[PDB]
Amino acid sequence: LLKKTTGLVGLAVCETPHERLKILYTKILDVLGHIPKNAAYRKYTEQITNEKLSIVKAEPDVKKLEEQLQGGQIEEVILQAENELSLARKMIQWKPWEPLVEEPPASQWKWPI
Amino acid sequence: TSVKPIFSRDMNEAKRRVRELYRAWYREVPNTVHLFQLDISVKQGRDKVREMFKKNAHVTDPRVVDLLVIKGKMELEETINVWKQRTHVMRFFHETEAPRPKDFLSKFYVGHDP
Amino acid sequence: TQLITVDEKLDITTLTGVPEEHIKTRKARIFVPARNNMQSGVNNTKKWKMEFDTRERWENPLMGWASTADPLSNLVLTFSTKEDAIAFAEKNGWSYDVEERKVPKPKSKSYGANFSWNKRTRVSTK
Amino acid sequence: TRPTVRPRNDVAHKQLSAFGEYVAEILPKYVQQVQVSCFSELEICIHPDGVIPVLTFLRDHSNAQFKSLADLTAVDIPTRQNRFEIVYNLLSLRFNSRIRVKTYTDELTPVESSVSVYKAANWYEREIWDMFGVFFANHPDLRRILTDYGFEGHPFRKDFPLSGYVELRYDDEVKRVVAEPVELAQEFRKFDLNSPWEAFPAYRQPPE
Amino acid sequence: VAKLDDLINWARRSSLWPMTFGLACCAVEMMHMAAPRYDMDRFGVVFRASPRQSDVMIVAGTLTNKMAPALRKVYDQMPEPRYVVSMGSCANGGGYYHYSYSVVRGCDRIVPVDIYVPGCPPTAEALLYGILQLQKKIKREKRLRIWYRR
Amino acid sequence: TYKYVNLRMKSVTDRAAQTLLWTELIRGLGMTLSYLFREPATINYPFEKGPLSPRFRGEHALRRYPSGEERCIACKLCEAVCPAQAITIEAEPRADGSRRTTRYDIDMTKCIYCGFCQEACPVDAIVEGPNFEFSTETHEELLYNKEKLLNNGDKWEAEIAANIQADYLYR
Amino acid sequence: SNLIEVFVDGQSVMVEPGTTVLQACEKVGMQIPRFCYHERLSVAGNCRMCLVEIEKAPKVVAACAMPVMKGWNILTNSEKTKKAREGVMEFLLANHPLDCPICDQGGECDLQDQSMMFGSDRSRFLEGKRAVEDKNIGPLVKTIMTRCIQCTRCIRFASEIAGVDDLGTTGRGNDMQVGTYIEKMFMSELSGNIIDICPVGALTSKPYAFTARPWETRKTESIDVMDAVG
Amino acid sequence: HPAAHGVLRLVMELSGEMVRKCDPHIGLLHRGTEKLIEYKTYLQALPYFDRLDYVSMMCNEQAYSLAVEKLLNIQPPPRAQWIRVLFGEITRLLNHIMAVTTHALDIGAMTPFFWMFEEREKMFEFYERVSGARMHAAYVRPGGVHQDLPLGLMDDIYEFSKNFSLRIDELEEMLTNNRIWRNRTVDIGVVTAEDALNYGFSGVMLRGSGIQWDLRKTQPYDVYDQVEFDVPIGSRGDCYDRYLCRVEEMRQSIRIISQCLNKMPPGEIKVDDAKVSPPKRAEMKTSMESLIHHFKLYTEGYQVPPGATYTAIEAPKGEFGVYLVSDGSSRPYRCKIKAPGFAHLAGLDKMSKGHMLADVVAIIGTQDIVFGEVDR
Amino acid sequence: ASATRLIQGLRNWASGRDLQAKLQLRYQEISKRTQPPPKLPVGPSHRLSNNYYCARDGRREAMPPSIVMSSQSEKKAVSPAPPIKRWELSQDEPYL
Amino acid sequence: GVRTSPTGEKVTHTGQVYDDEDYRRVRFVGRQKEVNENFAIDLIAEQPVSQVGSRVISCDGGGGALGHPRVYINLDKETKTGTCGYCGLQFRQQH
Amino acid sequence: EDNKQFFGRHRWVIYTTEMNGKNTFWDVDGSMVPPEWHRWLHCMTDDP
Ligand code: SF4
Ligand code: SF4
Ligand code: SF4
Ligand code: SF4
Ligand code: SF4
Ligand code: FES
Ligand SMILES: [K+]
Ligand SMILES: [Zn+2]
């Protein structure tokens, strides 16, 4: 379609969205491979990433991609994929699939007092 | 009894921060007197800083003295930059309050304060 | 690790900003409030109240309003049980007087006692 | 129960409970409790040391996308030993939802700041230090924003009185605005408005 | 000296120059008074932003503890003669926020107040009445007669 | 549902002629001159007054029964509902045993003029009346006692009763 | 131990035999509404506020008088319990005078509190209320029997604790008045205590009358020194 | 300072005359409302909300009433909902008039201020007729409203709404096409969508940056889903797009006011549960239950079930929210007020980087900031 | 409306619109300052039968918040809500 | 009918009057002491007593919804007249 | 009164010259209106 503006200030339009989306999805799969299998975040993020990759593989039209993926403009989809890759790097950094670090006191979530 | 530290691991580091804060305050007392056109001597302000430091010198908890050091840093930042007024600096020197009685006979004469 | 050990009593009189005279000379009171005898509900005697003493309240020179000098005259705090109230009172250095709660004794009410045969519990009117 | 009673939505309650299970299963290191209120509002209660690795998840995951920080609040409950209750309110625009993330801290325990996640907190938690005394670690510019410059004490603590400890007046003797001990012309009349009968049966705490 | 007193009282009361010192709700009420409905400018009342060229000051809003030195300095920079008109309830006795920890209980403690205008916010017609009362107070001044007697 | 604000040789010549000859500036000046030639909305105060309503919240007053006996019965609902705590009531039974008041003080520099007391009074004794031109010169003059409130009620009864008669069916 | 097991709202609790339904519900932690029952007076059971429903039983029992049995499930907040409470409040407020702003019990009244938290919010009574003439029993109790609800705490206190036996109920039906039938000055050493045990504003402390109000008062605990009882 | 909104202390590091570091020192109007609220009941704490944002009074009343009604599990009658929406749109027009005219006065065009302050006085007269006070109505209450509309008011509302669009067109001719007004706001205060969401901006700022978000269209309240209206969306993030958005919001407010005046249903004005809303004065003096409920409602206050909620409404400045926590008594345990002005003044540091000082006062003007709301 | 016809025409030309059609000053066309007394309608629960308070109480139906997970199969990835639908361009004034 | 204390001050209907040695009377010099001259008791005293034909009588103060809540007064006694709690009006029976 | 003027200018008052002993030829006050005329003048009712 070659839209001049996306309607949002400070969001440049990408010329080829399919290659960028495929590169980002392959990269997030490669990064998520390092997570242990028992983690729930790895399972759910791998599931949604594979679903989005299948959607972007099946159809070539940009407008039908924006309607099927329902993530708005494809620039927002690319930005969300980049943010998820950053979250995956921070996730292998933090390792939050371990159990509870500490237990709260007995009067910590009791409302009312 | 296991607590999370903020800045000071032990009492020695907290005392180092206290000495640093006193060094900075003793440095900046003459500029505070000169810039605000305060009508007191430099010695009065410096011994006021000494009096406050000796007043808050009963604490053995590293976290409490660390927070005291932080709040002194806030006061130093509000004094070094001209964000206060003449009255905000002069509020330390109580000049309008009459001297309260301290012995038992005078307090018995005045009122019911125990 | 990222943790240190502090083995001293929590005293935060220096960070609450209160003046000195309202720390050592004020006697706090930790108690369960008594039920108002004009009513019959006991919901108001469920939680512990921490209060302070009453200072002077003189008359105003204009119309005799209640002019006061105590800033802590309207400070009422609510705690779930006794131990947290004691911990909060000793945390701010306030000397405290603690009164234990007074649970009423479970009575033995019998409706037939008003219609006895050889007892003094025979009622005179109904 | 039609005209004067608020209608009840169950699909939103079910979806919020499912998302709460989703969050509590993705992050078992820090999440302590998940509760959905009667008016369909999710609440997540986590450990303080997991303030930062949770929030960025809710800012960066494709299934949450809580990109807005609406309100940041601390609540003072003097009964608990961790008397300060930090509350983050998050808003997701892509999914059109609101979530609440709650944690606890005492006076001397620092909390990790959230300016690395939401920049609006650059003011918000700063105001918290002005009002309660909760120290935030690695804040860029932490200074008092609401109270007076020379004010000592944190006013929003429940042990702080309604009227302060000092009051200002102009003095011709020193030509200056000075602070004096507080002396009110009329005392604040304290009212006992609590009815001594049981308020709600459904909120009945078990006895001792 | 009686008639010369009558002259300078007429000159000061018919060219009052207030200053743009509002703080709160009551400032919006002052701006509503300055609207074409009530037209302060017809009374010789034109807003001047500098304290050095102002005659009276209408304190509109809540005077907090962070605001008392500012109000005191602004009042002290005004040339004589100066009159202060309290406005609303916040600047009268604290009003709604009388018992608060950071509100001055009436701006009388900082500046000497000449005319008290009660309301929350006072209606612009009532404010015009208060300004006319201040004008009538200026009219009955007796400076030169008292100077002649002394 | 949504719209795009600001998303829009003859035209270039028209724009250059507007630049050089100031067409839209002349249009704005014409509208300014249009507002010059209209009738100004300045009402001649104090000989003219602005429009008001029978529900207007002004000066506090204490009404009376149509037999001379005062209306307040010392029930202390107004001082319990007052959000500013501006009302101070001290009560005792007088000589005939009627529950009346001895002190009824309203701090008018504390009052926020919100009309909760005029709607919480069970006998319509306290009324936020219609008077708004009651500015004073001293702070103590804005501190009404019971005698001043009763005098205000006896002063403004002739219109307070009419306003209540006009408005009481909406409550 | 002979403590039998009963149920309150499906929760088990063990009580001694002879324990009433009200006592069992208090032991669990719910304070059952009441007007005539007092824990230091003989049981009267003549206000029907305490009517609760035991399950598998087609009648509401008086919790202030009826003893419990094994396996009884006290449905404290079912539909018919609330219906009975609302009906009792409607009957109680059917003949009560509109005297709250002149009352000295306002703000500390059991009838107002229980009417808000248990009763309905509007009146179906479109007729004229009764008006009972006032009496006098001395300069210690201001006496307004228009507001009495015939709870009969007066007679039980004057017969059991005070032990003077001069108060009574004269009449039959809606014209029954709680009085003394003569110009008798009820004066004992514990007379003023009746002012504490009137759930309505029928009996008022005469020196205290028309002087203060409960919500504006500050309560301070202290010790009596006029005698050696303490 | 006239360009300052009465209480403000902007300390700026002028590098000659451009700003490199701007810091708004606030707190000159910190009254401490959120400590005075917990010492008062809900009816007594209702007039405190009239004075936070004193150009958006009824919207704050609506937000507080929505919070209390969400906690109380009750809803107002439909006539009360339509009245609330109509007066909220009148409030939106009030705020937009004040903001646009004060911004134009702070830039230098001082005529539309006097042109539309008489219309603002007309709406103040409408408030006077409907509630009894020109500014602080205390009209919207938990349970609906406080009083019904007087007879003959809606004809005045219809006449004013009929004749107000010509004034809107007059203002839009006087400022939008003016070249001097344009050149002050072409590329001043530009913001991006990522920095709009990450800085906590809400309302027009988001709609200045092309972000499509409005609380009246996504999370609707009382009757706003039964009214059709448009939402303006900017395209550059400058002050020009925000001013155009405010003018278009005024036009849509006129549209909503027309829809409200053509669709008001008959009925009552309070929740008929007398334990929350007070009873009528006619039946208070006849029924005993109504007298008891009036006594205890105006002396103690209705109880609220324990719990914490955070509600949010589309205030004329943005998103106005309250976090209300109740412990079961007749007084709130903790009432926190979330305001758009706090985050807007926080983002003022980022929005004003690289501009001249007159552009900083233009950026101050283009944020509709009321500092009583900001300082709470 | 107390202005001559030439001033009327001059104002109409210089403003570009018919100013006298929609005046900004009020006249006799508004409603009268006095009104007949109304008869306010009643609410829905002002009945006499089948109107027990327990069947329509709003405050008593509030429940405590339900704890989902407490610290004392391949489940699909869920969302807090379905995603917000794309906004429709207004057909009345699209500004395009 | 105001009474005059011999310090010169008028006496209010609540009975308050400043003593001759009280310094607070200096607040009244150069000014006036404002006191209502319409005494409530001396204005309700001369209102006549109404004889009714029934045992009990209902009083609302007149005006319907403009007065006090309606209270029923019993006139069973033949010695004292039944006085209204709010308005102060007194009724009786002709027998 | 004059009904041909616009709203707010349709009712007015000319004050007296001597009210309660003071010369009001120039010191005209806004609070010299009796309550019935105060009700009429501020446009509260159409009945004088
Ligand atoms: S007096 Fe009232 S209107 Fe004026 S600033 Fe104070 S709260 Fe606002
Ligand atoms: S109007 Fe409001 S603030 Fe004023 S006295 Fe009455 S209740 Fe109090
Ligand atoms: S509400 Fe009315 S009757 Fe009650 S004390 Fe106040 S003024 Fe008197
Ligand atoms: S006894 Fe209670 S319900 Fe009866 S009038 Fe007195 S306060 Fe009202
Ligand atoms: S006067 Fe009171 S205590 Fe005595 S029987 Fe009547 S209601 Fe009961
Ligand atoms: S309490 Fe049982 S019938 Fe009265
Ligand atoms: K009693
Ligand atoms: Zn009567």
PDB file of C-alpha atoms in Angstrom, chain E residues 9-125:
ATOM      1  CA  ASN E   9      -9.249  60.562  48.287  1.00  0.00           C
ATOM      2  CA  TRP E  10     -11.150  60.894  45.007  1.00  0.00           C
ATOM      3  CA  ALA E  11      -8.005  60.339  42.931  1.00  0.00           C
ATOM      4  CA  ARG E  12      -6.944  57.166  44.750  1.00  0.00           C
ATOM      5  CA  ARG E  13     -10.389  55.551  44.979  1.00  0.00           C
ATOM      6  CA  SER E  14     -11.312  56.027  41.301  1.00  0.00           C
ATOM      7  CA  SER E  15      -8.095  54.577  39.835  1.00  0.00           C
ATOM      8  CA  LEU E  16      -7.499  51.456  41.926  1.00  0.00           C
ATOM      9  CA  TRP E  17      -4.976  49.126  40.280  1.00  0.00           C
ATOM     10  CA  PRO E  18      -5.174  45.564  41.635  1.00  0.00           C
ATOM     11  CA  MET E  19      -2.523  42.920  41.108  1.00  0.00           C
ATOM     12  CA  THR E  20      -2.826  39.497  39.470  1.00  0.00           C
ATOM     13  CA  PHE E  21      -2.508  37.455  42.665  1.00  0.00           C
ATOM     14  CA  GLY E  22      -4.842  34.486  42.525  1.00  0.00           C
ATOM     15  CA  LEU E  23      -4.170  30.947  43.733  1.00  0.00           C
ATOM     16  CA  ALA E  24      -7.260  28.739  43.422  1.00  0.00           C
ATOM     17  CA  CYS E  25     -11.004  28.542  42.628  1.00  0.00           C
ATOM     18  CA  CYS E  26     -11.323  32.141  43.780  1.00  0.00           C
ATOM     19  CA  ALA E  27      -8.910  33.299  41.061  1.00  0.00           C
ATOM     20  CA  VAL E  28     -11.291  31.894  38.440  1.00  0.00           C
ATOM     21  CA  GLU E  29     -14.097  33.765  40.200  1.00  0.00           C
ATOM     22  CA  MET E  30     -12.049  36.983  39.933  1.00  0.00           C
ATOM     23  CA  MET E  31     -11.545  36.322  36.214  1.00  0.00           C
ATOM     24  CA  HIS E  32     -15.316  35.853  35.983  1.00  0.00           C
ATOM     25  CA  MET E  33     -15.778  39.233  37.649  1.00  0.00           C
ATOM     26  CA  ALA E  34     -13.441  40.820  35.081  1.00  0.00           C
ATOM     27  CA  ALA E  35     -15.671  39.420  32.303  1.00  0.00           C
ATOM     28  CA  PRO E  36     -17.902  41.758  30.238  1.00  0.00           C
ATOM     29  CA  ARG E  37     -20.853  40.849  32.491  1.00  0.00           C
ATOM     30  CA  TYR E  38     -19.522  42.876  35.441  1.00  0.00           C
ATOM     31  CA  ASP E  39     -16.659  44.897  33.882  1.00  0.00           C
ATOM     32  CA  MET E  40     -14.212  45.950  36.600  1.00  0.00           C
ATOM     33  CA  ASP E  41     -12.593  48.363  34.107  1.00  0.00           C
ATOM     34  CA  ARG E  42     -15.636  50.650  34.237  1.00  0.00           C
ATOM     35  CA  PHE E  43     -14.796  51.473  37.878  1.00  0.00           C
ATOM     36  CA  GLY E  44     -11.229  52.537  37.133  1.00  0.00           C
ATOM     37  CA  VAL E  45     -10.013  49.034  38.013  1.00  0.00           C
ATOM     38  CA  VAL E  46      -7.463  47.708  35.498  1.00  0.00           C
ATOM     39  CA  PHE E  47      -5.250  44.699  36.219  1.00  0.00           C
ATOM     40  CA  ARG E  48      -1.522  45.415  36.550  1.00  0.00           C
ATOM     41  CA  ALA E  49       0.874  42.508  37.024  1.00  0.00           C
ATOM     42  CA  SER E  50       3.666  44.295  38.791  1.00  0.00           C
ATOM     43  CA  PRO E  51       3.533  44.902  42.560  1.00  0.00           C
ATOM     44  CA  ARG E  52       5.464  48.159  42.069  1.00  0.00           C
ATOM     45  CA  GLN E  53       2.574  49.738  40.116  1.00  0.00           C
ATOM     46  CA  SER E  54      -0.370  48.267  42.047  1.00  0.00           C
ATOM     47  CA  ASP E  55      -2.660  49.918  44.594  1.00  0.00           C
ATOM     48  CA  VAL E  56      -4.581  47.021  46.177  1.00  0.00           C
ATOM     49  CA  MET E  57      -4.131  43.254  46.354  1.00  0.00           C
ATOM     50  CA  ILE E  58      -6.983  40.736  46.381  1.00  0.00           C
ATOM     51  CA  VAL E  59      -5.727  37.486  47.916  1.00  0.00           C
ATOM     52  CA  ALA E  60      -7.780  34.781  46.185  1.00  0.00           C
ATOM     53  CA  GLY E  61      -7.303  31.148  47.154  1.00  0.00           C
ATOM     54  CA  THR E  62      -5.610  29.111  49.859  1.00  0.00           C
ATOM     55  CA  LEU E  63      -2.424  30.487  51.416  1.00  0.00           C
ATOM     56  CA  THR E  64      -0.280  27.460  52.243  1.00  0.00           C
ATOM     57  CA  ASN E  65       2.880  27.214  54.341  1.00  0.00           C
ATOM     58  CA  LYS E  66       5.003  27.167  51.168  1.00  0.00           C
ATOM     59  CA  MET E  67       3.345  30.426  50.052  1.00  0.00           C
ATOM     60  CA  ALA E  68       3.599  32.740  53.084  1.00  0.00           C
ATOM     61  CA  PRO E  69       7.105  34.182  52.332  1.00  0.00           C
ATOM     62  CA  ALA E  70       6.065  34.812  48.715  1.00  0.00           C
ATOM     63  CA  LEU E  71       2.906  36.685  49.738  1.00  0.00           C
ATOM     64  CA  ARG E  72       4.824  38.604  52.410  1.00  0.00           C
ATOM     65  CA  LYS E  73       7.531  39.694  49.948  1.00  0.00           C
ATOM     66  CA  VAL E  74       4.968  40.652  47.283  1.00  0.00           C
ATOM     67  CA  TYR E  75       3.039  42.733  49.826  1.00  0.00           C
ATOM     68  CA  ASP E  76       6.255  44.312  51.114  1.00  0.00           C
ATOM     69  CA  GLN E  77       7.241  45.372  47.584  1.00  0.00           C
ATOM     70  CA  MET E  78       4.064  47.388  47.019  1.00  0.00           C
ATOM     71  CA  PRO E  79       4.296  51.189  47.346  1.00  0.00           C
ATOM     72  CA  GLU E  80       2.296  53.076  49.934  1.00  0.00           C
ATOM     73  CA  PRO E  81      -0.648  53.353  50.241  1.00  0.00           C
ATOM     74  CA  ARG E  82      -1.572  49.671  50.023  1.00  0.00           C
ATOM     75  CA  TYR E  83      -4.774  47.821  50.880  1.00  0.00           C
ATOM     76  CA  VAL E  84      -5.323  44.064  51.145  1.00  0.00           C
ATOM     77  CA  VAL E  85      -8.684  42.466  50.346  1.00  0.00           C
ATOM     78  CA  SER E  86      -9.154  38.953  51.683  1.00  0.00           C
ATOM     79  CA  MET E  87     -11.325  36.742  49.516  1.00  0.00           C
ATOM     80  CA  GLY E  88     -13.207  33.493  49.889  1.00  0.00           C
ATOM     81  CA  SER E  89     -12.999  31.436  53.058  1.00  0.00           C
ATOM     82  CA  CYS E  90      -9.500  30.009  52.543  1.00  0.00           C
ATOM     83  CA  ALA E  91      -7.902  33.457  52.790  1.00  0.00           C
ATOM     84  CA  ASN E  92     -10.388  34.494  55.498  1.00  0.00           C
ATOM     85  CA  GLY E  93      -9.998  31.793  58.136  1.00  0.00           C
ATOM     86  CA  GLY E  94      -8.697  28.763  56.285  1.00  0.00           C
ATOM     87  CA  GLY E  95     -12.243  27.744  55.431  1.00  0.00           C
ATOM     88  CA  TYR E  96     -12.495  24.120  54.357  1.00  0.00           C
ATOM     89  CA  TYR E  97      -8.791  23.473  55.055  1.00  0.00           C
ATOM     90  CA  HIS E  98      -8.612  25.267  58.414  1.00  0.00           C
ATOM     91  CA  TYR E  99      -7.405  22.203  60.337  1.00  0.00           C
ATOM     92  CA  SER E 100      -4.882  21.053  57.719  1.00  0.00           C
ATOM     93  CA  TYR E 101      -1.184  20.765  58.510  1.00  0.00           C
ATOM     94  CA  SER E 102      -0.003  22.992  55.635  1.00  0.00           C
ATOM     95  CA  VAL E 103      -2.587  25.790  55.398  1.00  0.00           C
ATOM     96  CA  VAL E 104      -2.249  29.188  57.060  1.00  0.00           C
ATOM     97  CA  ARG E 105      -5.380  29.740  59.162  1.00  0.00           C
ATOM     98  CA  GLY E 106      -6.409  32.974  57.497  1.00  0.00           C
ATOM     99  CA  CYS E 107      -4.049  35.315  55.652  1.00  0.00           C
ATOM    100  CA  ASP E 108      -4.399  37.920  58.423  1.00  0.00           C
ATOM    101  CA  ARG E 109      -1.387  36.291  60.106  1.00  0.00           C
ATOM    102  CA  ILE E 110       0.875  37.304  57.196  1.00  0.00           C
ATOM    103  CA  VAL E 111      -0.557  40.573  55.848  1.00  0.00           C
ATOM    104  CA  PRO E 112      -2.916  43.186  57.375  1.00  0.00           C
ATOM    105  CA  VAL E 113      -6.299  42.691  55.697  1.00  0.00           C
ATOM    106  CA  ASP E 114      -8.579  45.679  55.079  1.00  0.00           C
ATOM    107  CA  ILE E 115     -11.730  44.206  53.484  1.00  0.00           C
ATOM    108  CA  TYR E 116     -13.087  40.715  54.183  1.00  0.00           C
ATOM    109  CA  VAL E 117     -15.172  39.172  51.389  1.00  0.00           C
ATOM    110  CA  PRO E 118     -17.063  36.039  52.540  1.00  0.00           C
ATOM    111  CA  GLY E 119     -17.988  33.218  50.206  1.00  0.00           C
ATOM    112  CA  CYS E 120     -16.779  29.996  48.684  1.00  0.00           C
ATOM    113  CA  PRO E 121     -16.330  31.408  46.116  1.00  0.00           C
ATOM    114  CA  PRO E 122     -18.025  34.759  46.744  1.00  0.00           C
ATOM    115  CA  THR E 123     -20.246  35.857  43.881  1.00  0.00           C
ATOM    116  CA  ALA E 124     -18.734  38.444  41.538  1.00  0.00           C
ATOM    117  CA  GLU E 125     -21.517  40.886  42.427  1.00  0.00           C
TER     118      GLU E 125
END
